C-alpha cells in the first residue's frame, strides 16, 4: 500500500530508543532489498539483503561517505524468503543500530556516522511490496 522506493523522513534525526518498523512482502523473484539511513548525500547505514550473490544469500551492511563505500560487514544468517511477508525492526541504541527480522535478533551495526541528529531520512527500496513504515519511541 506504499510505493517503492519510499522515503520516510526522520525529523530531527535518530535518537536512542527510537524504533522503526517496516512491514512488507518479498516479491517472487527478488534480487535485493535496501534500507538506506541518510545524512544528506552520505549513507550512515546501508542494510542490503542480497538474494543471489554468487548463488548465495547474504546480508551486506556498509556506510557511504563522500560518495565512497567503506568496509562491508557481512552476515550469512538470512531470514528473508522470496514471496513471504516480513517485519524489519530497527532499534537505535547508543552505540549501534540493532536489527530484528520477524521478531528475532539479526545483527548490530556500530555507529560510524556519529551525528545521529543529522540522520534524517530513511530510503526503502528493492524487490518488495511495502505495507507500512513507521517509528515510535520505546
From Swiss-Prot:
The modification Phosphoserine is found at residue 76. It is found in: Cytoplasm; Nucleus; Secreted. Its main location: cytoplasm. A major expression is found in the colonic epithelium. It is also abundant in the activated macrophages. Expressed in fetal membranes. Residues 6-136 form the Galectin domain. Galactose-specific lectin which binds IgE. May mediate with the alpha-3, beta-1 integrin the stimulation by CSPG4 of endothelial cells migration. Together with DMBT1, required for terminal differentiation of columnar epithelial cells during early embryogenesis. In the nucleus: acts as a pre-mRNA splicing factor. Involved in acute inflammatory responses including neutrophil activation and adhesion, chemoattraction of monocytes macrophages, opsonization of apoptotic neutrophils, and activation of mast cells. Probably forms homo- or heterodimers. Interacts with DMBT1. Interacts with CD6 and ALCAM. Forms a complex with the ITGA3, ITGB1 and CSPG4. Interacts with LGALS3BP, LYPD3, ZFTRAF1 and UACA. Interacts with TRIM16; this interaction mediates autophagy of damage endomembranes. Interacts with cargo receptor TMED10; the interaction mediates the translocation from the cytoplasm into the ERGIC (endoplasmic reticulum-Golgi intermediate compartment) and thereby secretion. This is Galectin-3. The lineage of its organism: Eukaryota, Metazoa, Chordata, Craniata, Vertebrata. The gene is LGALS3.
